[PDB]
Amino acid sequence: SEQLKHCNGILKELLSKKHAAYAFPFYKPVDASALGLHDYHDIIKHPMDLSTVKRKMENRDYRDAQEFAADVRLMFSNCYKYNPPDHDVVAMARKLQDVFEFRYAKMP
Ligand SMILES: COC(=O)C[C@@H]1N=C(c2cccc3[nH]ccc23)c2cc(OC)ccc2-n2c(C)nnc21
């Protein structure tokens, strides 16, 4: 749909080199074992990341823009839940979420 094309455009922007300096933590699922975050999956019940959003978009999983937005927002919320608010990753999440929200608001 037209709205899903807008969402795909947003997705491509979030993955683009333009935003890589602060988007990179969100590219792939959090590897909790790798990062030593042995409480991550006790605190975060529904992990989400941009590669998962991209797979869902490619597989036509999302039926509308609202479903797409809920997953992107879940990704950011997981970051805000797990990490203290002064953490560098939280600053990065806030910056990427600003990119997302401002462009999502321009939905046709
Ligand atoms: C040691 O990891 C952490 O304290 C949490 C982790 N931080 C980071 C993180 C991201 C950016 C700067 C950072 N400084 C210390 C940790 C950290 C992180 C890094 C990644 O690299 C592939 C992927 C995911 C995360 N991430 C997300 C998303 N949510 N929390 C994290």
From Swiss-Prot:
Changing L37A: Reduced binding to histone H4 acetylated at 'Lys-12' (H4K12ac). It is found in: Nucleus; Chromosome. Residues 1-107 form the Bromo domain. Homodimer. Interacts with E2F1. Interacts with (acetylated) STAT3; promoting STAT3 recruitment to chromatin. Interacts with CTCF; promoting BRD2 recruitment to chromatin. The first bromo domain specifically recognizes histone H4 acetylated at 'Lys-12' (H4K12ac). It also specifically binds histone H4 acetyl-methylated at 'Lys-5' and 'Lys-12' (H4K5acme and H4K12acme, respectively). The second bromo domain recognizes and binds histone H4 acetylated at 'Lys-5' and 'Lys-12' (H4K5ac and H4K12ac, respectively). Some specific inhibitors of BRD2 that prevent binding to acetylated histone are promising therapeutic molecules for the treatment of cancers or inflammatory diseases. ABBV-744, a small molecule, has been tested on tumors with success: ABBV-744 antiproliferative activity is mainly restricted to cell lines of acute myeloid leukaemia and prostate cancer and is able to displace BRD4 from chromatin. GSK046 (iBET-BD2), which specifically inhibits the second bromo domain, is a promising therapeutic small molecule for the treatment of inflammatory and autoimmune diseases. Belongs to the BET family. Chromatin reader protein that specifically recognizes and binds histone H4 acetylated at 'Lys-5' and 'Lys-12' (H4K5ac and H4K12ac, respectively), thereby controlling gene expression and remodeling chromatin structures. Recruits transcription factors and coactivators to target gene sites, and activates RNA polymerase II machinery for transcriptional elongation. This is Bromodomain-containing protein 2. It comes from Homo sapiens (Human).
